[PDB]
Structure formats: structure tokens, C-alpha cells
């Protein structure tokens, strides 16, 4: 697989670059997933435990504060960050599978995006 | 190896090199009221000065305005920077404590 960093050194460099960028802000890759981009993300976010979502929101606030101040996390806090520790992808995949099941049986969608 | 048809005159500055104007800035073709010697170069420079004034008669007022207002606007930019940073310092120097680590 060309996306696997264990095989492609280009993929490995890509992953290292993204990880360094996320680490500078204390953000997780899943924190970049926004509930306003997709309704499925909103649903998955709503299914997660309060503590996970609270930690996400705190990380987002910390990152926004750093972005406003033109400063990165101190190097000691950068050493303990986990940029690719996942909390969202499994829930999102389950939500997408459920929506596909609903569509395959002719049911109405459980939620819809508003027309802007 | 370049030939010019009758009624035209060679001038390398003119596009194509063949102009219908004959050479007119011949030495002492004019006489100057201030006794300035009217060589071809002198009259060329003077007539270009006159033509440049004719094309842009507002130039001196424009440059005075430009100097004045660019200086004033630079002062205003320094003040605007101070104003913005004064208003934003309470946000930029704030200490934020949150529960989350990774």
C-alpha cells in the first residue's frame, strides 16, 4: 500500500510532517474534523462520551489561543502530545455504515443538511 | 544594406526605421530670448520639457500632495499599529488553563 508509512518512505515523510505540525499546536488529527463540514461528523461527535468531546474542545481552545498569540506549545508539552491517537474514525465509520444501510433499504435519512 | 524610399528619412528610434518627419532640430534653428546657445541637443531637451509639462500640467501639485499625504499616512499607520496592539494585548498576554493534555 502506497499510503502505509511502513512501506513508502514518502508516506513516512508525509506522516512525520503532519505529526510535527499537529504537535506544535497540541492538536490531534481527529480534532481537524469539523461538525460543520459533514452531518455524519456531527452525529458521530454526538455519540461520543462527554469526557472525549470535552478534551477535544479544550484542545481546540488551546490551539486557537496559541494561533492567536503566534506561539507554539512549549517543547516539554510537545514531547507528551499524541497527534495520531484516534477517537473519532471508528464512530464515523459506524455512522456512515448505518446511513448506507438506511439508503439501501429505501428509508428516510436520520438527519439532513440545511440548504444555505 | 538598408535603403529608404524617397519621402522618408531613416531614424532607428522610430518603429520600422523610416519616418515621414524630416530632421527639424538643426543647429540654431531657433533663437533664444536668454541667449542660451540653441544647439540641437539644447532645443531637444527644452522642447521635451515643454511637451512633458503639456502632457502633465498637474505634476507639481500632484507630487507635493503625494509627499505630504504619504508622510501623514505613515504616521497614521504607526498610530493604527499601536491602537490595534493596545486593544489586543489583553487577549495576546492572557493565560489560559485547560484540563486537556494530549
Amino acid at each position: 500500500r502506497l499510503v502505509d508509512p511502513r512501506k513508502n518512505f514518502l508516506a513516512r515523510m508525509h506522516m512525520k510532517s503532519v505529526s510535527n505540525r499537529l504537535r506544535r499546536y497540541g492538536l490531534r488529527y481527529d480534532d481537524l474534523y469539523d461538525p460543520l463540514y459533514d452531518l455524519d461528523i456531527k452525529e458521530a461527535l454526538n455519540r461520543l462520551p462527554r469526557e472525549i468531546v470535552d478534551a477535544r474542545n479544550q484542545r481546540l481552545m488551546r490551539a486557537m489561543d496559541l494561533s492567536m498569540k503566534h506561539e507554539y506549545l512549549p517543547d516539554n508539552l510537545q514531547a507528551v502530545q499524541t497527534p495520531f491517537r484516534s477517537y473519532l474514525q471508528d464512530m464515523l465509520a459506524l455512522v456512515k455504515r448505518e446511513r448506507a444501510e438506511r439508503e439501501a433499504l429505501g428509508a428516510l435519512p436520520l438527519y439532513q443538511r440545511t440548504i444555505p | 544594406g538598408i535603403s529608404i524610399r524617397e519621402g522618408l528619412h531613416y531614424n532607428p528610434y522610430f518603429p520600422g526605421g523610416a519616418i515621414a518627419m524630416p530632421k527639424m532640430l538643426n543647429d540654431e534653428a531657433v533663437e533664444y530670448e536668454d541667449g542660451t546657445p540653441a544647439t540641437e541637443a539644447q532645443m531637444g531637451k527644452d522642447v521635451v520639457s515643454f511637451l512633458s509639462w503639456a502632457a502633465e500640467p498637474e505634476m507639481e501639485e500632484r507630487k507635493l500632495m503625494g509627499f505630504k499625504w504619504i508622510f501623514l499616512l505613515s504616521l497614521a499607520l504607526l498610530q493604527a499599529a499601536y491602537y490595534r496592539r493596545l486593544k489586543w494585548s489583553v487577549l495576546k498576554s492572557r493565560k489560559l488553563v485547560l484540563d486537556v493534555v494530549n
Binding site: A79, V80, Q81, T82, R85 | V101, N102
Partner: peptide
């Protein structure tokens, strides 16, 4: 080091 999961 990052905390364990």
C-alpha cells in the same frame, strides 16, 4: 514521553 493510551 506521551502518556499511555
Amino acid at each position: 514521553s506521551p502518556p499511555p493510551p
